Structure 1
């Protein structure tokens, strides 16, 4: 998904992207705490996706100078 990450422009790669993933992780952890989640690999894959987005943004910023 890294290529698709590059294709998006910078604001789109943070605004309404690293925010929806954050809120989804929040809801997922709430459901797990309550006691009804079933599928549990979602947490790990969401966290990995967030890290990917942050790293590509930082790479762009570093290359900009």
Structure 2
């Protein structure tokens, strides 16, 4: 997701997305170890998404205080 969109969702809604993304990464890693992953580029993409979300969250909490 691009920041613009992430910025539209509610904080709670963001947290959920982060949870989901973290599960995708777990699964992706297990597939790689076994030997059933083709798009390995997916791994990096997921990691960066998780970061994008956490950045938005912190920015909102700083703004508050």
Question: Measured at CA, do residues 7 and 54 of structure 1 come closer, stay the same or move farther in structure 2, by a change above 3 Å?
Answer: closer
How far the C-alpha of 1:12 sits from its partner, in A, is 3.3
TM-score by length of 1: 0.83
Greater fraction of residues in helix = 2
Unaligned runs of 5+ in 2: none
For 2:21 and 2:9, the matched residues in 1 are separated by 17
Question: Aligned with 2:15: secondary structure?
Answer: coil
**Structure 1 segments unaligned to the other structure (5+ residues):** none
Structure 2-normalised TM-score? Answer: 0.83
Q: RMSD value over aligned CA atoms?
A: 1.8
Cα offsets for 1:9-44 (capped at 9, x unmatched): 444344321000000000000000001101110000
- Answering whether residue 20 of structure 2 is matched by residue 14 of structure 1, we say no
2:3 aligned with 1:3, yes or no? yes
Once the 2 structures are TM-superposed, how far is the Cα of residue 2 of structure 1 from its aligned partner? 3.6
